[PDB]
Amino acid sequence: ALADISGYLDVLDSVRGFSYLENAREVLRSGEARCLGNPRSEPEYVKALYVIGASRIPVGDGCSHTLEELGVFDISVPGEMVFPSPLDFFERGKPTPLVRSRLQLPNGVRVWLKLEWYNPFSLSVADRPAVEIISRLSRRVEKGSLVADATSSNFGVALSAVARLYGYRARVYLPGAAEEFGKLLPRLLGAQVIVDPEAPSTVHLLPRVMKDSKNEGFVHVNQYYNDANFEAHMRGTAREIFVQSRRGGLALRGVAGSLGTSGHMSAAAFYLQSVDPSIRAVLVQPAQGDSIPGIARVETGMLWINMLDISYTLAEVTLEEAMEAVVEVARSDGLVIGPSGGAAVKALAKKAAEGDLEPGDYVVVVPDTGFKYLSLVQNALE
Numbered sequence: 001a002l003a004d005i006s007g008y009l010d011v012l013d014s015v016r017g018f019s020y021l022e023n024a025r026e027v028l029r030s031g032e033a034r035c036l037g038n039p040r041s042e043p044e045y046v047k048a049l050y051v052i053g054a055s056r057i058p059v060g061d062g063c064s065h066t067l068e069e070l071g072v073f074d075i076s077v078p079g080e081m082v083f084p085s086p087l088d089f090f091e092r093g094k095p096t097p098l099v100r101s102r103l104q105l106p107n108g109v110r111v112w113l114k115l116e117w118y119n120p121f122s123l124s125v126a127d128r129p130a131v132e133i134i135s136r137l138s139r140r141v142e143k144g145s146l147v148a149d150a151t152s153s154n155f156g157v158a159l160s161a162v163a164r165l166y167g168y169r170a171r172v173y174l175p176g177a178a179e180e181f182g183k184l185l186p187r188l189l190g191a192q193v194i195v196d197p198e199a200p201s202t203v204h205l206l207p208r209v210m211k212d213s214k215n216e217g218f219v220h221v222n223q224y225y226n227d228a229n230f231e232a233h234m235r236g237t238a239r240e241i242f243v244q245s246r247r248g249g250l251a252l253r254g255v256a257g258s259l260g261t262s263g264h265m266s267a268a269a270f271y272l273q274s275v276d277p278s279i280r281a282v283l284v285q286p287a288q289g290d291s292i293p294g295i296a297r298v299e300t301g302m303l304w305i306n307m308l309d310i311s312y313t314l315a316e317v318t319l320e321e322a323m324e325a326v327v328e329v330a331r332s333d334g335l336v337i338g339p340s341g342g343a344a345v346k347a348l349a350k351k352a353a354e355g356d357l358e359p360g361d362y363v364v365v366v367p368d369t370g371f372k373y374l375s376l377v378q379n380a381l382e
């Protein structure tokens with residue numbers, strides 16, 4: 001028997017740890033889940049179902065239900081694209097577009113582009129964690145409270161708009177080297193913004209955000225460590241690759257992406273590698289010395305990409321190389337990607353060139369629009 005999962009979403013404020021993901025992998029790999037006699041005695045199982053994108057849960061004595069019965073494959077989007085509110089537009093206007101690129105890579109590596117700038121608040125992937133984190137937060141923390149974090153740019157914009165749609169106040173902390181949209185947009189959206197000229201990278205701002213949180217009593221929502229960030233991308237960004245691949249007819253053989261906190265490619269890789277362990281996750285290591293806005297090297301510290309059981313390859317990519325790839329996707333497809341998207345296109349194009357990749361369809365996850373990166377556009381043309 002099928003019942004609604006919304007009612008049983010207190011498991012989000014009770015299950016801790018990652019042991020529950022063992023349930024996810026088996027349900028996904030099998031393509032079904034066992035009926036629960038007592039839904040409340042199985043917090044791990046219920047959470048796993050929500051995390052893979054179920055809308056319903058299987059209840060009763062001995063039965064099972066398929067992923068489609070559970071609602072992993074439910075179409076959310078109104079054909080007409082009419083939404084009664086922006087927050088509902090983020091929620092139901094999904095998947096973000098998967099576009100097959102005219103870009104040709106060697107060895108029959110076919111490039112598809114998942115365009116995460118089709119998010120309403122930050123025109124970047126960072127929307128998805130920001131709605132998930134703040135949505136759970138609405139359960140516990142009183143309205144009018146200040147919520148805050150460090151950001152390269154995208155999450156601080158996403159946090160600011162979503163915080164304010166949920167009644168909460170927003171503070172974002174940025175390194176001096178971040179883009180102007182990050183420093184400016186939150187203020188347009190009613191947040192306070194603090195910029196540390198000396199902080200060379202976003203992770204380096206963390207101690208400052210923790211100290212001030214201890215002094216001031218604001219809630220530091222902490223995207224690096226906050227498990228909602230990984231869970232958003234499990235039921236959203238990852239799940240969508242799963243569903244679109246099947247419905248699109250794709251011979252999916254891999255994903256390509258970039259790493260900041262590691263939330264989205266950790267979720268894509270894990271979800272996809274549950275369904276089929278061969279699927280590669282080609283990830284980008286920004287080259288040493290260089291700065292690619294939004295992303296970083298793994299060994300500067302990432303939660304999920306380390307601790308979860310994920311097969312992944314790295315490819316080194318310089319900024320100049322990421323910008324070359326912006327330019328060529330823009331000439332091939334006329335779509336203008338952000339620096340971090342070009343870093344993942346490039347990194348896939350290398351493994352493809354190397355001969356390390358099987359023939360078939362790869363989905364690259366493009367985190368934002370190049371329209372927010374005029375300086376790095378200008379510099380890459382000259």
Ligand SMILES: CC(=O)OC[C@H](/N=C/c1c(COP(=O)(O)O)cnc(C)c1O)C(=O)O
Pocket residue numbers: 124125126150151152153154155156202203258259260261262263264265293294295296338340341367368
């Ligand atoms: C460096 C860092 O931790 O940034 C996290 C977060 N950025 C995510 C991000 C990423 C990486 O996504 P995640 O690994 O954080 O899921 C890639 N590209 C762009 C343009 C991004 O904005 C932010 O905006 O604060």
